[PDB]
Structures are given as C-alpha cells and as structure tokens.
Design a protein around this ligand. Structure first.
Ligand SMILES: *[C@@H]1O[C@H](CO)[C@@H](O)[C@H](O)[C@H]1NC(C)=O
Ligand SMILES: *[C@@H]1O[C@H](CO)[C@@H](O)[C@H](O)[C@H]1NC(C)=O
Ligand SMILES: *[C@@H]1O[C@H](CO)[C@@H](O)[C@H](O)[C@H]1NC(C)=O
Lengths: 98, 36
C-alpha cells in the first residue's frame, strides 16, 4: 500500500468497441424523441447522425441491417430501431434552384 | 480413452487446385454495390 505512485496498482479497462451495420447492442443515455417524417430535421438513429428528411420507404433490408448506403458514402436509408420500419433519407438541400 | 490407431495406411496427400474458391470478407466494413 505505501509504495510510490508509480509502483501502486492501477486498474485498466480497455473498452474495445466496434460499430457495424449489425443491430445496435450498447447505446448511450440519449433520450429518444418522436419521429418527424416530412420535415428537414437533424436525425440521430443509433449514433448515426445527419441532417435530412425522413420518409416512409419500401426498400428491403437484411434482418440485421441498420442502414443502407448510396454510391457515395452517404446513408440513404435507415431502419428505425423502435418501430423497425425503414425510412428513406433525403437531403434537405435542393439543388437546381436558379 | 484414446487409442493409437491400428491398421493405418501410411497416409500421403494427393494434390489438386483450389480454383476460384476460399474467397471471404477481408474487413468488417459494410459495402453495397461496390467494386474494391
Ligand atoms: C419500444 O417501446 C415503445 C414504448 O414502450 C413501444 O411503443 C414500442 O412498441 C417498443 N418497440 C419495440 C420494438 O420494443
Ligand atoms: C502412441 O504412440 C506414442 C509413440 O510412442 C506413445 O508415446 C503414446 O503413448 C501412444 N499412445 C498410447 C495411448 O499408448
Ligand atoms: C489443376 O492444375 C493443373 C496444373 O497444376 C492442371 O494440370 C489440371 O488440369 C488442373 N485441374 C483442373 C480440374 O483444372
């Protein structure tokens, strides 16, 4: 007990965590709000944040898939883990206005 | 209880080709409609 602080024991927990397209297992304390399905909002489904419009989607996901992907590295669809529905994600910005 | 096998046949290997087999997923990253 009475040794130098360099010789005293330290407990180390090396929390190695990976986030994949699998269903989320551990989540933070963030409180789940309601769902807005026609307005440009800031969304955060399972830690995957973004800014867009969520809409009802008819795409089919794998039973363990949480989000889809576009040709670019942008998630165009996300499975809402409460209702288990699939919501299409659309950009808030509309390009083409002159 | 283990028994040293009797009536063995001096095991020797044949050899062939693996063809286009054994492909697996190099990484856990999700990819869709990609070419990497
Ligand atoms: C999640 O909890 C809410 C509120 O209790 C409930 O209405 C909903 O059906 C639940 N969904 C799942 C998948 O458990
Ligand atoms: C099998 O043979 C080896 C080689 O001598 C010997 O060491 C081993 O004990 C044998 N196994 C049994 C179960 O007798
Ligand atoms: C396997 O590869 C050898 C060359 O090493 C070739 O002679 C043989 O025809 C191949 N077998 C088949 C089934 O293609």
């Amino acid at each position: 007990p009475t040794n130098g602080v360099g010789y005293q024991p330290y407990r180390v927990v090396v929390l190695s965590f990976e986030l994949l397209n699998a269903p989320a297992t551990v989540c933070g304390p963030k409180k789940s709000t309601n769902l807005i399905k026609n307005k440009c909002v800031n969304f955060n489904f399972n830690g995957l944040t973004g800014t867009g419009v969520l809409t009802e989607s008819n795409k089919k996901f794998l039973p363990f898939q949480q989000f889809g992907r576009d040709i670019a590295d942008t998630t165009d669809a996300v499975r809402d883990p409460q209702t288990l529905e699939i919501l299409d994600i659309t950009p808030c910005s509309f390009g083409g206005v002159s | 209880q283990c028994v040293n096998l009797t009536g063995r046949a001096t095991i020797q290997p044949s050899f062939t080709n693996s063809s286009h087999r054994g492909v697996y997923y190099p990484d856990t990253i999700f990819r869709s409609n990609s070419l990497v």
